[PDB]
Every structure is written in structure tokens, then in C-alpha cells.
Subunit: 358 residues, 4 copies
Amino acid sequence: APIKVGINGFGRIGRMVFQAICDQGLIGTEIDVVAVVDMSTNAEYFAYQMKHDTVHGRPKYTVEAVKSSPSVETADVLVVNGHRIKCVKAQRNPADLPWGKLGVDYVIESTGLFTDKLKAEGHIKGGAKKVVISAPASGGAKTIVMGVNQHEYSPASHHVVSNASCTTNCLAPIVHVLTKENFGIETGLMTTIHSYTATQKTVDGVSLKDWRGGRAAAVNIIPSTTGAAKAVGMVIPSTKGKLTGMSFRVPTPDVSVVDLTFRATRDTSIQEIDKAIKKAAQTYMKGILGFTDEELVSADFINDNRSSVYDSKATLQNNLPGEKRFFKVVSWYDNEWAYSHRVVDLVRYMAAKDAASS
Amino acid sequence: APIKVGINGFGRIGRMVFQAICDQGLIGTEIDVVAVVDMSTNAEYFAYQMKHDTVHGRPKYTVEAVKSSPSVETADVLVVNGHRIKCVKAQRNPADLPWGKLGVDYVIESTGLFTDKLKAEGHIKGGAKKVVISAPASGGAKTIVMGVNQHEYSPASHHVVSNASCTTNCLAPIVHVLTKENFGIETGLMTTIHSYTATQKTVDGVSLKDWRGGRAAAVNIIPSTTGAAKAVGMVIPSTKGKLTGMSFRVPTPDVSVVDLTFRATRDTSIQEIDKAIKKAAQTYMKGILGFTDEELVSADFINDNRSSVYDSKATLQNNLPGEKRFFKVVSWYDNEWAYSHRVVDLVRYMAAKDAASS
Amino acid sequence: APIKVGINGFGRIGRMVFQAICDQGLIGTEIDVVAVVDMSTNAEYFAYQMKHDTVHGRPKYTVEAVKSSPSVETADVLVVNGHRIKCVKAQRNPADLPWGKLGVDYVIESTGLFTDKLKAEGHIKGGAKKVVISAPASGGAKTIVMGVNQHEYSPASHHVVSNASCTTNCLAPIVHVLTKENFGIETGLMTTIHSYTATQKTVDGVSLKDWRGGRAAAVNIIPSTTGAAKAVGMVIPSTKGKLTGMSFRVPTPDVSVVDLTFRATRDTSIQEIDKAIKKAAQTYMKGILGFTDEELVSADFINDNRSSVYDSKATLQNNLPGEKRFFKVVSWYDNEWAYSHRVVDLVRYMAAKDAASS
Amino acid sequence: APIKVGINGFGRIGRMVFQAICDQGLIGTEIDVVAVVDMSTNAEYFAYQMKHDTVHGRPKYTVEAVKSSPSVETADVLVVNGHRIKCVKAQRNPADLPWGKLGVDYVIESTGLFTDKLKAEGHIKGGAKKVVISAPASGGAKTIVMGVNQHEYSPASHHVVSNASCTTNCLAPIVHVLTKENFGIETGLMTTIHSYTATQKTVDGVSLKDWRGGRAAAVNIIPSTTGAAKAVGMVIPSTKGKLTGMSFRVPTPDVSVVDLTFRATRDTSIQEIDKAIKKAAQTYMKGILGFTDEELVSADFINDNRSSVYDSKATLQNNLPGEKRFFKVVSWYDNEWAYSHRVVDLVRYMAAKDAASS
Ligand SMILES: NC(=O)c1ccc[n+]([C@@H]2O[C@H](COP(=O)([O-])OP(=O)(O)OC[C@H]3O[C@@H](n4cnc5c(NCc6ccccc6)ncnc54)[C@H](O)[C@@H]3O)[C@@H](O)[C@H]2O)c1
Ligand SMILES: NC(=O)c1ccc[n+]([C@@H]2O[C@H](COP(=O)([O-])OP(=O)(O)OC[C@H]3O[C@@H](n4cnc5c(NCc6ccccc6)ncnc54)[C@H](O)[C@@H]3O)[C@@H](O)[C@H]2O)c1
Ligand SMILES: NC(=O)c1ccc[n+]([C@@H]2O[C@H](COP(=O)([O-])OP(=O)(O)OC[C@H]3O[C@@H](n4cnc5c(NCc6ccccc6)ncnc54)[C@H](O)[C@@H]3O)[C@@H](O)[C@H]2O)c1
Ligand SMILES: NC(=O)c1ccc[n+]([C@@H]2O[C@H](COP(=O)([O-])OP(=O)(O)OC[C@H]3O[C@@H](n4cnc5c(NCc6ccccc6)ncnc54)[C@H](O)[C@@H]3O)[C@@H](O)[C@H]2O)c1
């Protein structure tokens, strides 16, 4: 049973979803990537985009750009590891995409334009059974963070699911062991020192909705907002209105770090917390939550696919010496990598439960 | 008599041309900026963008944003030192712009989208008399570099003119005094090590016309094409087919350097060349061509309004010891600031020549 | 009566303390900078460093390099605006510095090698009557943040004064009015997102005492320690053990931002806190604390000489909506420029007190 | 029969040479690394430097840090792949290093300090049989570029050998096929847009020998000099006094590119030169000279061990269309990694020739 997926928007996350599908062994055997969609249908230019990444390197798979038939002027079929993917043209409305016809059942929505559960339904109107939004979703969609609440999915009810944001996926696992191990956050504020993204600008330009976010990106520390402010309360309803935060966008191109400052419900210590987070990383959060005892800096997390990886030393040293309630917890994440692995983990969970019931 | 100008595209070059008008003492008196055009009309947002620049800092003029009538919702008039500039909404076609209505005669075309003579003429159809494309132009518009061939301008024939590009305004000064002081160039190639611009990308992205241009801009050395390649031959026909080159877009926000390598027509020396450039700096090319004897790096050329500023020490330490024909000439330039100043000098030179005749 | 000073270690803070002295209009008239001490004595090189700065531009003063005698090989005296500063060679011990000879009474200890009280007394034995260390000090030196506790300085008891770090001169204003306006801080942790410094490395290199800190500076988010972790308790005895923090060094050359997360003593609001700080900013903290109501990023604080300028918007927008105990204060600072001005303002304060008593 | 080698200066090149020895299969069987030398004897700090590199990522090999006796305070032995390397304490004179005692015959000198052939013999007085200087040398040390002139090595008389610089290793292959294939280079001039290195400064600071080299590294285009200005004439004497160049140090942490403008000795075409370089890349320069047909940028050459990998499209698109003599040739290089592999290649060659005769 090849899960038939199509990628709408072959950008940073689209191309890293694609690469997490090939690197993890699933192309053409477990998941069938039927088609990819973006502005051009020049498969040679997509191959160029895949083969050479500034931040994550050359990939291990191989890519060819072949035509479907010599009647077409430019290569339109991509051939990865002998698997053929089709380069479909970008549609302004989700519904004008031929999903049903190409036989695509699960569509990964990663353009960034269709974050509303209502516009994303246009995929299903085009023929898709399910939709995963690689972002926070507005308008009613289900937001799941793997390792914390993927089980609340239901094939029957949830058809446009959302995998939250990179920072949610990092914060929430931290929050989830704090509650489940019962330290509890009474209240919590959080900062994500975060790499710049494709929504920012090389030099000072136009950004109407966030004035600061239009400042030259690679030469300014830019205050702005994070997506995990809302979404962690959505995933864990016990933190609704207990926790919020901001974002500082600094001049690195990938990897970010969460910096959570909370107050505990019961009296505890940072040694108890560090123990429970390591334990959790080895037992029930394994693969999603990780930890590190080394003096790592940010470029040591490029290509690290844990959702979140707790920094044991930066935490243990930077807390109040005899504290029972006021705690800092530092944790890292490759915003482009681990998040792209979680999208594929979610597709496959959903396909499993969709077959499990119908 | 105030020159009635309208800036279409209030971006890096739009806003710097505006600020140059204020810093030189022309607003309201010598130059009247009737209107600016961009993706919004919210003048409180153009205020912010004028008041805070990452590279060139805070401006000396004062900016206020007020509403034209109490009927409008968001402030839509700019007021720069008690002079009113209007914030007109952007049009997909130049012909649709109310230029004759607003009373604009000269339009500075700096959107980047209308570098063709004919899409630029839509301005004259919208009620403008003359257009200055802040870029090189296709379709046959007049290309004039100030200090070299601005005298070639005719009020009768040149309605869409072009002030070439930043690199062309840096290299043609140098090429000009080499041809005029009789050293000559037999053939020559050129390289601009240049700052990234707003067409480049924060993270690897789509750029289907120059594939490399699409790669993360601030973490890479990206080879690409320079404007001064085509344009130095248009300005000096003597260099047609004898001079071409490339760009290496490197991770800095502003200022670029030209690295010219040429073979001279007669047997000379680099000290003869160094003295002639210094001479031409102090005599005929003043304010256009400049020079330095100091050990400077790119950050020192921020806000240097010279088109070309020769580096006497880098040229001299990095040429062959007793050479008569093969030489290197190095020259800096603030690609944003100086080019903007030269646009204003062109507007003013055209507007005076037009009055002197009609 | 010129306050006889000499700067030991003319680097970033040494040249910004020097430009602060000249710019405020003090050189020659109120402060006589007798000598500057560094790894060289080539006043031509020192003058290359003064005239061109990558982050703070061309200075307002003029620097000339003169020979004290034609008997010396290279220029060894700096003439800044007609005034003569001598270039004395760098000693490995403060003690062997000719202070008593040169006439120097106040020494600004900005090498960053003699931060302990006792190696700092090495200048006094050698002739200086007073010493200001541009860094937190060990061995029991008096730590003073201007505008918070300079009233505690006593000419009799305190000869080796510490002006604390740049982050404590940003964090200590805000903790001072939070206690003075009785909100009070129960416990609190802080993070500074901070620009890389002279003590960091261009490529991965050696740093034996903090491992992460030797990593490539300009391409990593390097977690580390801050100086305000100790210093804010030395200055504000109330905060002894209630507040600590950490630093994240990010890829910008200058300007940083504190991000304090505290739990107040009483029940309050962020609009209450917002008013209290702004008020304080206009009244008793005017010149130390500042605020902004604008959407500014880090490069808008280059050359802002307030110790701490509070960002009203980023705070109000990124706090929990109806919270009474758990808050986040965000505040900027130009760690090179603001600090250096406090240095010149401590010399000036201490000096007059000494002249008041003896 | 292992070659016994010691590395002095375990910095960027020392650690990359170490990693090229383990990568190429050579550690413990073909090359035995007896000792590594740097500021510390802390095996743990060395292991942290090896395992986490910002640019080249995690090494494939495994590093442990053990104590050589229960008596030593801190781990002083590395155990890379079961092979034990000693951590010898850094010395001020090469001669005071225990090479004969340890049993070291070949010494990779890579501190950046002992670049004089006389200072380098200190190693042979310390007990070593040969010295390789990972940098151009003075005082008459024989200079070799692998792939161009290592056949000029005489076991007999060449004792302290210099592997030239990274730019001579990129430049000399290109210059070598142009003279061997009989295009010739009459006079030539080059420029290398180049990543910053460890001799540079994060923020503006001290640099007495090159004034510009002290300016903040990651925020300027810094003109400077190159090592291949001297060394290529020494490897290829045909080109002494005929070829020279300069350097621009830009804000990338690794990879650099050679922009070479030369005039041929005979009428030829850029198409012809393009074929010759591809041909060479495939036959006698294989593994040393490569080429690319792709639209690559600097980051695509990280971990590319060819010494010089020619850009076919950048060279072909940026030359004069009718030219027969005056050309531009562009070739890339990962300045840390390819040079490191070549140092191992020379040590290996040298050692086999020395065995062959004695
Ligand atoms: N990078 C990270 O760290 C990260 C982490 C977690 C989550 N995410 C999230 O994933 C999403 C994508 O982010 P990213 O970083 O990959 O950004 P990106 O800009 O690299 O990727 C977006 C991609 O979508 C493409 N695209 C634009 N309009 C499209 C369209 N119809 C419209 C159309 C049709 C015709 C014409 C015009 C428009 N149809 C299909 N593709 C279109 C773009 O060309 C681009 O390749 C965002 O929501 C972001 O929040 C990013
Ligand atoms: N920066 C430098 O160093 C430099 C130096 C020399 C020369 N230049 C040249 O000047 C030009 C501008 O470069 P820049 O660096 O200022 O770039 P920039 O991107 O900062 O400026 C371009 C500006 O034009 C605006 N714009 C886009 N479409 C527009 C439109 N109709 C279209 C429309 C209408 C409605 C919807 C959609 C589209 N009408 C009016 N404004 C529009 C953008 O919002 C932006 O503010 C380029 O040709 C560049 O080569 C730059
Ligand atoms: N930049 C900021 O944001 C900032 C803000 C606040 C506070 N600070 C603090 O101020 C201090 C300086 O920082 P910075 O950023 O200016 O750094 P910097 O490296 O730019 O300045 C240090 C200066 O001291 C010089 N120096 C070294 N050894 C010296 C010596 N004897 C020794 C000697 C003699 C002979 C040989 C060898 C050694 N005698 C005199 N000068 C010597 C260096 O050449 C350099 O110019 C630090 O403690 C730092 O924490 C910096
Ligand atoms: N990175 C590149 O792209 C590249 C490419 C090609 C070639 N290279 C060349 O290789 C050389 C090294 O460059 P790099 O980039 O690796 O620089 P780097 O700074 O990373 O490496 C230099 C290493 O030498 C160490 N060192 C300093 N003094 C030493 C000493 N005695 C002295 C001592 C003893 C006690 C106290 C004080 C001093 N003995 C042993 N080690 C010492 C440093 O701690 C450092 O680890 C340079 O000549 C450079 O031109 C670099």
C-alpha cells in the first residue's frame, strides 16, 4: 500500500519533506510521491534545486529530469531513485489542482498561501482525501504535534489536519513532559531566537503586516511573533492562556533555540526537571525529544531531526541556584529539518488510521 | 519653477533618490515631489521606511504622515519638511497612473518591472512628459551616465531615458578618463564583487531566470551577470565588443567594488594611470569620480555619493612591476547612495535642457 | 581643571570612550587625555583606526599623527583637535606604566586583562590615583552603574571602580525602577540576544574556558554566559540570588537586547509597568533609561547612547493578556556606544566627588 | 610500514588534515599520527573541536579522550578509531619539541608561525626527518603543488618543503594546463574573492602589517593580498614576473573563487580552453582539477576535495564573444578542505620517494 502524496509548494519545507521521504527509505515503496507543484514545470530547475542545498548539502538520492513525451519543450518529470514524480503547474485556487485525477490521496500543503482550513479544503474539492498543512491552521483545522497528541486524530472527523509550526513542535514536547511528570507550568513566557526564513528580506523592504519583519534580515536582530504562542495551548489545552511568547530573528539561515521561562505548580528543582527530560528522551518521547550534554552551538543541529533537543548544560548552569519554582529551559531545533520529518511521520500515521477504520 | 516629479516604486532606490533630493536642498524649491507610488497608500508606513534605514540610518529631513481629507481612513499624505507628497496606489500598468492629473511631468521609474522603453512609455500616456528608468533599458531608451555623455541628451528625442545601473556608473567614469587621456583599452574584462540586492533571496528559492541568484544570498558567493556589460558600450560605443564582465554577489548589504583588468593601447605605466585618474578626479570628473589614499574597507564607502572612487593603494600594490600594457584598476561605490544621487542630477539636467529649448 | 586621564587598551571600548570624550566636547577643556596605551605606538595606525569605524562611522573630531621628536622613527603622538595625547607602549603589568610621570590620575582600564581589583591596583602604585575597569571586577572592586548607585562612591574608600558590563548597564536601570516603583521582583531569569565581540572567533578556534565561544561567531547562535548575572546583585543588593541569566551570541557586530522574565511582588499589569518605565524614562532616569514606541530592529540603536532603551511595543504585544504576576520586559542597547558613554560619565562623576572631599 | 607524523598547530588546517587522514582510510595502517600539538594538552577539548565543526560537520571517525596514566589530571590522549594520538604541549621554538623521542619522522607544521625555512628546521633539530609547511615559505624552502611539480622533490636535499597556499593550489593547476597545452600566458592578473580566515577579526581591531585586515570580518569586503602572488612563479617558473594578483576577503566562512584574467601566447578561443580544462580534469590532472557544468554557488563546494574545480558556465558566459587572446577563467575551491587533503597527498608522496632512495 503506497500512500499516494502530492506536494503543493516545493520550497524549503516541500523539498525537505521530499528529502525526508527519500532519506527515510519510503520513496516509491511505502509512500508514492505522485506529483510536486510550484511556479515552474521545468523539472531540470527542480533537479538543480534538489541536488544542491546551501544548508543541508547534496542529498543521497539521485535525480533526473526527463520529459514525459518529446512533444514537450522542457523536462517535466522528475526521476528520483528510479521513481517518477510529476511536475504539476501552480494553481491559484487549490480546487483547480487535478489531485483526484493523478490519484493523489494525501496532499501536503506547503505554499504558505492556504493556511485556512477553508481554502485548504479546495484540495479535497480537487480530489484529495486528506490535507496536511505544514503550518498553523486557521478556520477550524486539526493541529497535531507528533509525540504529544497525534492520537486525537480521527479519520472520520479530521480531513484538514495541520502540523503546527517549527517552534510549536519544539516547545510542546518540553511542555508535555513537564505536565505528564507533574512539575506543571503555572505560567510561562517563551522566546525563540530564530533563524531567518523565506518570508524575510535581504535588504529593508515592504512588509505591511509586520513592520519590523521587512528589515534587512541578515544584519539586524528583529523582534516579531511566533506561531507557538497559540498552537501549544491548542495541542495541550491545560496551557491555554498560561503560556505565550515572542521571537527574535537573528542572522543565521537555519536552526533556532527555544528559551522557556516558566513557574512550576509544585515545588521542585532544575535537577529533577533535567532528570525527567533526559528520561523522557530515552523512553516515551524518544525520536521527538532529544538532549545534549555537549557545549554545542547552532551549526551542530543542522540536519538533526529530533523535534526538540534539550540543552542539558545551558539549562543546568543558567538557573537560580536553590530554586523550587522559577525555571529556564533551553532547547534547540533545526526548524527546516525535524519539522519536515514530522510532516512525513504525520502523513504515514494518518494513512495508517485511515486504513485502520476507513 | 519646481520640477514636478513622481517616483514610481518607492523601494531602496526610490527612497534613496527621495532622500538625496532633501539632503541636497531641492524639496519644494527646486524639486517638487508631487507623488510617490508603491504597494500601499498608508503613509504612516512610508514614514517608518523613511525614518529607519538599516544601512544609511536616520535621515536629516522631518517626516510626518497626515490624511489628505478627513474622509480617508489611513494617513495618505507625506509631509517632508512641511512639503506634501502624495501616496498613490500602485498600478499594474504605467498608463493607468494619474500623472497628468496630479500635474507630474518627470517620472522616476524605479519599480524594476518596466525596464522596456515601451512599458516605460505608459507613463507618458498616463500624463508624464519624461521618464528616467533607474536601471538599464531594453526597447531602445537613451542611456546616459552623468559625467560621461549627459551632453548627448536631446529634449526633442529622448523621452524615455535610462541612468544605466550602479556598476555602469562606477566603471564608465574609469573607462572614460582612460579613453580621453589616450591610454585606451584594446580589450578588457571586468568583475564586480557586489552587495546583494532585494532581488536575491534569504534562503534558497526560486529564480528561474538566473538559477544561482535564487540561492541563499547572505551565506554564499553567487556568480552572476552585471548590467555594466551591455551598458558601458551604449555609453561609450568605443568599448562595444572590447569590454564585458561578471558579478560575484557576496554577503554584504551595500557597497560594491569594480575590479577592471585591461590591456592598454599604448605602452604606459600604472603610475601614469594613477596620476591621470587622480587628475581627472580633481578636474573634469569632480563629484563623479573620486579617489582615496587610505586603507579602506566597504563600510567606509557607506554614504559616499561618488559614482566611482578609485583606490589608489589597492591598484598600485596589486599590479605587475614594470608593465606597459596589462593593468588592474580597483574602484569602490555605494551602489544605493551614489546611483540615487546621479538620478537626481539627471532629472535636474534633463529638466534644465528641456527649458532651455522645449 | 582638566581631569587627567589615560586609557589603557585602546580597542572597541577604548576608542568609543575616546570618541565619547571628544564628541561631548570635553577633550582639552574638562578632560585631558594624556595618553593612550596599546600594542603599538605608531600614532599613524592609531589614527587609521579612529577615523574609520565599520559600525559607528567617521568620528566628528580630527586625528593627526605627529612625531614627538624627529629622532623617533614613526609618529608617536596623536593630535586630536590641536590637543596632544601620547602613545605609550603597552606593559604586561599595570605597575610598569608611567602614570605618575605622565601626570595621569584616572585610568580607564579597558584592555580586558586586568579585571581583578589587584592587578588593577598595579596602575595606582605606578602613579594613578584612580582606576575605572570597563568590565565586572573581582577581588572586591566597587561596581557602579551610573544612574542607579553612583551615590555610593566614596573618594576615600573606593579607588578601583568597576563600571560593570554592557548588559548590567542595560538590565540594572529596569530592575532599579521595578523596585523603586514597588512592583518588585520575586525571582527572575534573563537572556540577552547579544552581538559578537572582540573575544570571539571568525572560524572555529581556541577558547578553553568557554567551549562554545570559540565557534565561528558570525554563522552560529552560540549560547553562553553573561556578565549581568553577577553584576546586578553587586549593584542592587535586593536582587542577590533572585535574578540570573544567559547570553546568546548571534551574527551581528553591534547592538544587543535584554529580555527579562520576572514574577512581580504584588499584583500588577504590563500597562502599569509600561507607564512606570516610560515615566521614569522622562523623569529620574532621563539619559540612562529610554523608550521607544516604534517598530525598530537592532540597527536603529547604533549610536544610541542610552544605557537601556525599552521597547514598549514588543513588550505589550508579547506578554500574557490579563496577567498579574508573570511578565517579560524587552529592552535594547548599543553595547559599544552606550557603555563607553557611561565610562566617561563615571570619570566625570567620581572626579568631582574627589575634588569635593579629597 | 606506517609513516610517523606529528601535527604542530591543530587549528583549522591541522584538524582538517587530521580528518583527511582518517577519511582517506590511512589512519593506523598507512599513516600513524603519533602526536598533535596546540595550546592545550586537553584531549577532551580536542575531541570537542574534532567532533563538532561549524562548516564541515561531524566527522565519520569516532573520538575518545583518555588519560595516558592514572596520574595525569586531564585526559591527554586521543583515541581515534582505536588509534592513540598524544597531546603534546605547545612550544615556542620547533626545536624544543620531542619529535625524536616520540618517534616522529614527518612533521606537518600548521601553526602559521614557523613559515621561515630556518625556523622550520627546528623540527628536524627536535628529531624529525622532514617538515611540510602548510603555507608558502621563506628562506628557500622548496615549494610544491601536488599535480604540478611534486616530481621535483629530491629526498636528498629537500627537507623542509612548502605546500604553497590555498589560492596557489587552485591557480597553479589552471596555469599548468594552459602552458602545457600551449595556449600560454603572456601576462596574467588574478583576483580571489575569498572567505575570511582565522587571522581576521570579528570586530575592528589590531592588524599592523595589513591595516585593512583588522577591520570587522563578517561585515566588509576587505582588499588584501594573496599568497599565490609569489608561489605560482615558484612552482611554475615560466610564469615569474608574468602573473600577479590580489584578494578580496568577503563574509563567507569557507570556499573561495579564483577569477583569472590572462592573455594567451597564441590565438585561441574560450571554447578551446574550456575543452582542454575538461580534458585535463579527466586525464592527467584527475582528482586535483575538476570542473562543473552546473549553476553552483560557494556552498556547493564545501567538502569538495578537488584543488581547483573549474566553473564551465561562469567562464563561458562571461568572456568576449570574438576573443582570441584576452580571457577570464573562473575556478572554485574549498580553501580548508582541498588544501588539507593535498598536504596528506604530498606527505605520502614524499615518504614513498624517501623510502625508495633514502
Ligand atoms: N523554513 C522553516 O524553518 C519552516 C519550518 C516549519 C514550517 N514552515 C512553514 O511551511 C510553509 C512553507 O515555508 P518554507 O520555509 O518552505 O518557504 P518557501 O518560500 O521556501 O516555500 C514556499 C514554496 O511555495 C511555492 N508557492 C508559492 N505559491 C504557490 C502556489 N500557489 C499560489 C500561486 C499560484 C500561481 C501564482 C502565484 C501564486 N502553489 C504551489 N506552490 C506555491 C513557492 O514558490 C515556494 O517554493 C510556511 O507556512 C512556513 O510557515 C517553514
Ligand atoms: N539597490 C541598488 O544597489 C540599486 C542600484 C542601482 C539601480 N538599482 C535599480 O533600481 C530598481 C529598483 O531597485 P531597488 O534596489 O530599489 O529595489 P526595491 O525592491 O527596494 O525597490 C522596488 C520598489 O518597487 C515597488 N514596486 C513593485 N511593483 C511596483 C509597481 N507596479 C507593479 C505592481 C502593481 C500592483 C501589484 C503588483 C505589481 N509600481 C510601483 N512600485 C512597485 C516595490 O514595492 C519596491 O518598493 C531596479 O531596476 C534596480 O536594478 C538598484
Ligand atoms: N565591545 C563591547 O560591546 C563592550 C561593552 C562593554 C564592556 N566591554 C569590555 O571592555 C573590555 C575591552 O573590550 P573591547 O570590546 O574594547 O575589546 P578590544 O579587543 O577591541 O579592546 C581591547 C584592547 O586592549 C588591547 N590590549 C591588549 N593587551 C593590552 C595591554 N597589556 C597586556 C599586554 C602587553 C604586551 C603584550 C601582550 C599583552 N595593555 C594595553 N592594551 C592592551 C588590545 O590590543 C585592544 O585594543 C572588556 O573587558 C570588555 O568586557 C566591551
Ligand atoms: N584555513 C584555510 O583556508 C587555509 C588554507 C590553506 C592554508 N592555510 C594555512 O595553514 C596555517 C594555519 O591556518 P589555519 O586556518 O589552520 O589557522 P588556525 O588559527 O585555525 O590554526 C593555527 C593553529 O596553530 C595553533 N598554534 C599557535 N601557536 C602554536 C604553536 N607554537 C607557538 C606558541 C607556543 C606557546 C605559546 C604561544 C605560541 N605550536 C603549535 N600550535 C600553535 C593555534 O592554536 C591553532 O590551533 C596558516 O599558515 C594558513 O596560511 C589555511
